[PDB]
């Protein structure tokens, strides 16, 4: 009963709603820009460095 307060006082779970399109569409430019933007390497980095 306490945990339900976190979710609007709702007891019981619906199944997680599915996505009609599992991946971003082409017309959705912003996700493409983030995907094809320069990858940051550093203190907060996502890929192997140049010489690594």
């Amino acid at each position: 009963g306490k945990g339900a307060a976190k979710y609007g006082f709702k007891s019981g779970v619906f199944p997680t709603t599915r996505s009609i399109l599992k991946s971003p569409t082409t017309k959705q430019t912003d996700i493409i820009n983030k995907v094809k933007s320069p990858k940051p390497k550093g203190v907060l980095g996502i890929g192997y460095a140049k010489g690594v």
Binding site: G42, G45, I46, G47, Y48, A49, V52
Partner: protein
């Protein structure tokens, strides 16, 4: 950075050297071992040279 399982317990690989201070330590050790040596040799030469200069006296 996370990778495929590379062994029983190794699931990460080195991505970037943020700072190479350990490499600096290794290089500086290797350099120092002989860098001090040259100064020691010339110090010994100077010390014995002053010994001889006083010996003339």
């Amino acid at each position: 950075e996370a990778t495929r399982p590379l062994s029983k317990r190794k699931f990460f690989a080195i991505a970037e050297i943020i700072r190479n201070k350990g490499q600096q330590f290794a290089l500086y050790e290797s350099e120092a071992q002989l860098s001090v040596a040259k100064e020691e040799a010339q110090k010994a030469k100077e010390f014995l040279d002053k010994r001889s200069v006083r010996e003339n006296k």
